C-alpha cells in the first residue's frame, strides 16, 4: 500500500498547484503516485491492481457515483474527494457511507493533508488486516533482539555463513524475522488459544460460518487424525469412504477402530465418482454392520466432499439421513465453499446447525485458497466437549508452530471478506466456465482429434452442474439424480482413446505424454490418469495462465500432427534413456502405449477390480500391530492370494486405496490381482512411464513384492 | 423487415457513389435505410430493434469480427460485406459459416445489387418464419375471393357497416384476411393434422423436446380436459393436486372419476406452496386409496407445476417415485422451460423418456410466452395410442379454429429458436433478478416501511433458488430440501402487516389498496392476496415497464406517508361510493382494513381451514349428476354443515378450491365454515373491497347462500 492515484489536470491553477504540492509531500512520505487520465482509466487501474491504497479526485468534474463504483470494486478503499464548488449541502447518505475523506484546495497546506492521507492509509491497512497477522507485522516492524528459540533469531544466523547468506538473500529479511516462537508473550500461543491467536480462531469461525474453528499447522492429513481420534474412540466403528486419503488409512492404523467402507462409483476414465444414495440409509448400514466381525453401530462417518475430481455431494441428504452422531467431511479440495452461493447445500457448513449430530469439515486451506503449505482448518458445527477436543487437537499438532503458516492460514480467510473476496471467487468461477466453453468450442473448431473436457454438453450458467441420470457425459451408470454436482473450477481435460459408451477407440494419446509435454513447456498439471488431466482453476489463475495452457495444448496438437521426434519435442523424456528414444516419433510412441493399454484391456480391469471389495480378515490397527512385531514377509506379487496384506497398496492409475492394510485378496477378488499384474506388466516396457504403485516394491528381475503377514 | 443499415462514409468516391446509388435503389424497393455512425452504433441499433433485416458495411475498415458479434446477437441476419482491398484469399471458415453475402463497388451496378438484397431479405423472412405462419402470410398476400365460412370473407362485410367499419379500422385489414376456415385446402386442417398444420405440430415437437405435440385452440382449460379424458377413463381413479384450476374440477364433474387429493403446504401469506415428498410414495397413496370408497389404484396424476406463485418441483423425484402410469403436469404458468438451462430438471419434458409411464405437459402458451389468448399446447413424452388420443383431442376442440390463434401459437415457439430466443429468456430472467435486487435494496434504503419481496435473503446468481429448510424467508415449516425452486420472473411483492414468524404486525397495508393505486396510475397487477402482489416478468417486460412499476411503488409510498385523501389519490375507488370515501384519509382506510383482518384473525383461519380436508361423501361427477336433476337447494351459509355441496366454493383469498362439489363440511372441518363466515363478515364493511367467493351467492340482507344437495 503505497500507490495513491490522482485524477486529471483540470486546467486552472488554484486546484493544481495544491495538487502538485500534495504530490511532492506524498512522494516525501514514500508514496508512489500514479496518474490515471480519466474515469475509466481509474476503474481499470483499480481492477488490474491491488497495491493501490488511495484515490485523490476533484469533487467537481467527477461526481460521487465514482465512489459507488469503486465501493462495488473495493469497499474499504480510502478515496480523497477535494471540495471546491459543491458546498456542504450537496452530500447524500450513500456518499457518507463510503470511504471518502473531504479536503480543500489551499496553498501551503499540503503537509497536513499528506499527514492525514498517511494516517488514513495506516487506518486502512490496520482495518483490512486480520488481527494476528496485524500483530505479527507490528512485532516485526518493532523488531526486537531475542534470546529464545528459533536459533536463527530473526535470521541473524543466516547473515554469517555463505550458504546461509544465499538462503537469506533468496528468502529476504521479513520472512526470517517473522519466524518466532511462543516465548514472545504478546502474540499469545496457538496451543492454548490465547490473545491474538484466540481472536484469530474467532475470526475464522465468523468467516466460514462455523461454531468453533481451528487452525492446524501440519495439514489436513493431521486434521483428519485429530477429528477421527476425538470422535472415534478405540473399539468403536467408523463409516469411512473408500475414496479416502492415505491420511485416513494412517489414522485407522493408529487407532483401534473398525471400518465399514462406503462403495463409490466410477467411470471407464478412472475418475472416482461417488457413493450411491442407497449406502447412506439405515438398512444398508445395519446390514454391513451385521456381516462385519467385532462391529457395532458406527459412531463417526468420514466422507470425501468433494472427490479428487471435484464432485460435490447433496450434503443436506447426508446430514438428514445418515444416522450417525458425527459426520466428517474431508473437504480438502473444496475450502472456498462459503464465498459463492453457487455452493449452497454443498458442504458440511452449508445450512444451519443440524440437530443431534456434530458436522466436521477439514478444509485444506493451502490447496485451493491462497495460503502457505501445511495449512489446514477444522470447522465444527454442533456441540463438542471443549476440553477433550482441544486436548485432541493439542495431541497431534506441534508445540512451536511456524507463525508464517499460521499468519498465511488466517490471511487466506482475510482475503475473502468484503467485496474483494467475492470478486475473487466469482472471477475464478467465471474464468473456469469461459475456459470450458472455449475448450468445447476449439474441439468443434479443429480438424481431426482434439482434447475433450468431461463436462455437460450444454453449460452456460454459473452453477454446479448436476450429474443427471438422463445424460451420459459423466459415465456413471444408473446414477442418482441430485447427488452429484460438478465443480466448475476443477477442469478435467480428456484425450482421445475412449469412446462415449466406455469402450476404447483405436487412435489415442494417453495423458502421460500430454502432461510431460506441458511440463516441458513450463506448465504443470496436477495429476493425470490414463486419459485425463486436471487443472485447478483456483483464485490464482488469471487469463494469462489460461491462455498459455490452451496454447500449450494447441502446440502439442500441431507437433503431434506434424509428428516430431521425441528428441526434439521431449528432451526431458529423451534424457531418461537416449538409446531407446533416439529414432522414435511421437505418433509411434503414443500408438504403442495406447496399444499396450488396449491389448491388456486396462479400463475393464480397472473397473472390475474396484467393483469388488477385498475380504477384511482383521482391522488395519491389528495389521499395523502385526507389522510392528516383525511378522511381515515379502512374497512376490503372483502368490499374494490368501495372504493378509500389511502395507497399503495404492496404484497409479487411479489414485485411490485399492487394498487396505489387513485385507485378503480371495478368489472372489482375483481381478484385483489381475489388475495389479497387468499394471506391472505394462509399466516395464517404455522408460519414463514407470509403474507408480505405493506398497509394491520393485525388484531387479522385474517382478514386484508386497509385504504380507506371516502364517 | 424493411430496415437495412449502411455503415459509415469512408471518404473516397469510388466506394461512396455506388453506396448512394444502392441507397436510392433500395429506397425504390421500399426499404427504410438507417445510418449508424460506427461499430458500437450498429451493435446498439441491432440490440434495441428487431425490424432490421440487413447490414451493409465495407470489408476494409471493419473486419469480420463484426460479423461474429452480430451472429451472437442474431444468427440468421443477412449482412452485406463490400469487398474492395481484401482479396478472395482473406476469408476464414468462421466467416463462411455466417450470413454474409459479398459484393463489389461498381458504378451503375446498383440495380442488380438491390435485387439481390431484396431476394436475400425474402430468403431471410422465409427462413425465420415457421411453416404454417409462412403459408398463412403467403395466402393473405395472394388474397383470393372466397365464398366459404367465415361470413366476413376477408373482412369485406366490415367494410359495409358503420360499427363494422369502426371494427375494421381498429383491427386493420391483415387480421381480417387472416381469419379463414378449413375450406381453404392449401393450409391443411388442424383437426386432421395435415399439410402445413402437420409440419407445425412436428415443429412444435422439435422445439419443446417432446415426442408428439398438440396445439389447442381453446386453452389449457381444454387441454387439461383432453389429457384427463384420454388417460383417465370413467370408473378409474386420479391423483389430482388440491392446488388445481377450475378446469380440473370441471373435468372431474364431466367424467366418472374418483379423486385422492394431494395436500399442499402454505404459509401465513396465503401463497399456495407445494405437496410434501411423503405424498408421492407408494405407502401414502395406497393408504389414501384404502380409506376412499369405491377407489382403486390411480391410473393418472395431475400436478400443478409450477404453482400460481411460481414454485417449481423436483420433477425427477416425481417421475421416478410416483408409481402411476401417466403423470400430467399442468404447466400453465411455466411454458418457457426448455429455453434456459436454469429450468433443467423442472418440467415434465426435462430429462429423457421415462420408462413405463407417459408424461404429459400442457403449457399455456399465451400466459408467459408471446401468443394470442386461448392458445395452448399438449406435449407428451412416451407412447400413447395415436388414434385414441387424437380422437380425444378432436373431441374437445372446435372444428373451425381461429387461424390467428394457431399462427400465434406456432410463432410463439418460433420466437424461441436460435440466439434471439435464448437472448429473450436470459434477458427476462436477468431483468427479473435485477429488479429483485433493487427492491430489496430500496427496502434498506428507504425510511420506515417499504415493500418486501418474498425471496431468499441472498440472491445474486441466475438460478431457481431452492427453498431450504434451514431458512425462513418462504414460511413453509418443515419443508423438504430440493423439492421447491423459486421462479425468478414471478416476483411476489409483500406489504407491511406480517411479521417474519407468521404473526401479524400492527402497522400494515393490505395489497388491495396498492393494487388499486397501481391500476389508477396505469399499471396492472396479475392478482393479489391479503398482503402480496404478483408481477409476471415475461419476455415482454423491458426496463421501461420495470422502472415505471418501481416508481409507482415509490409514489404510493410518498402519497401514503403524506396521507393524501381517498378522493384525490383514488378517484376510481372514490366513485364506488362518494358518500363514504368523502372525508377519509388513506392511512385511516389502510389501518381500518388491517384492523378488520387482525381482529378477525384472517391468516390463522386461512391456514387452519386449508389444513383440514372436507369429507368426500360422493364423487364430483355424482354431485354434477344430482345438480342436473334439480336436487339442489340454496341453504344459507351458517347451516351448511352436514350438507353435501353441489357447486365449488372458490374464495378470494387465496384463489384455490376450498370446498369441492360433492364434499361435506363436518364438525372436524368447522374452521372452513368459520373462515367463510369471517370472509363474508369482513367483506360487508368497506365498499370497493367486496367479497369475491365463487360459489357463494350474495343476498340482499347480507348473508350468503351456497347450493347444497337435497336430503
Curated annotation (Swiss-Prot), chains A, B:
Factors inducing expression: Part of the cadB-cadA operon, which is under the control of the Pcad promoter. Expression is regulated by CadC. Induction occurs under conditions of low pH with excess lysine and anaerobiosis. The global regulator Lrp also has a positive effect on the expression of the cadBA operon when cells are exposed to moderate acidic stress in the presence of lysine. Repressed by H-NS under non-inducing conditions.
InterPro entries reported in the protein's UniProt record: OKR_de-COase_N, Orn/lys/arg_de-COase, Orn/Lys/Arg_deCO2ase_major_dom, Prn/Lys/Arg_de-COase_C, Prn/Lys/Arg_de-COase_C_sf, PyrdxlP-dep_Trfase, PyrdxlP-dep_Trfase_major, PyrdxlP-dep_Trfase_small
Q: Which GO terms describe its molecular function?
A: guanosine tetraphosphate binding; identical protein binding; lysine decarboxylase activity
Taken from the UniProt entry, a GO cellular component term is: cytoplasm
The subcellular localization recorded is:
Cytoplasm
Task: Kindly list the positions at which N6-(pyridoxal phosphate)lysine occurs in this protein.
Answer: 367
Q: Which SUPFAM superfamilies match?
A: Ornithine decarboxylase C-terminal domain, PLP-dependent transferases
Which GO terms fall under biological process for this protein?
lysine catabolic process
The way its activity is modulated is described as: Inhibited by ppGpp, also known as the alarmone.
Q: Which NCBIfam families match?
A: PRK15399.1 (NF011928), PRK15400.1 (NF011929)
Belongs to which family? Belongs to the Orn/Lys/Arg decarboxylase class-I family.
According to its UniProt entry, the function of this protein is described as: Inducible lysine decarboxylase that catalyzes the proton-dependent decarboxylation of L-lysine to produce the polyamine cadaverine and carbon dioxide. Plays a role in pH homeostasis by consuming protons and neutralizing the acidic by-products of carbohydrate fermentation.
Protein name per the record: Inducible lysine decarboxylase
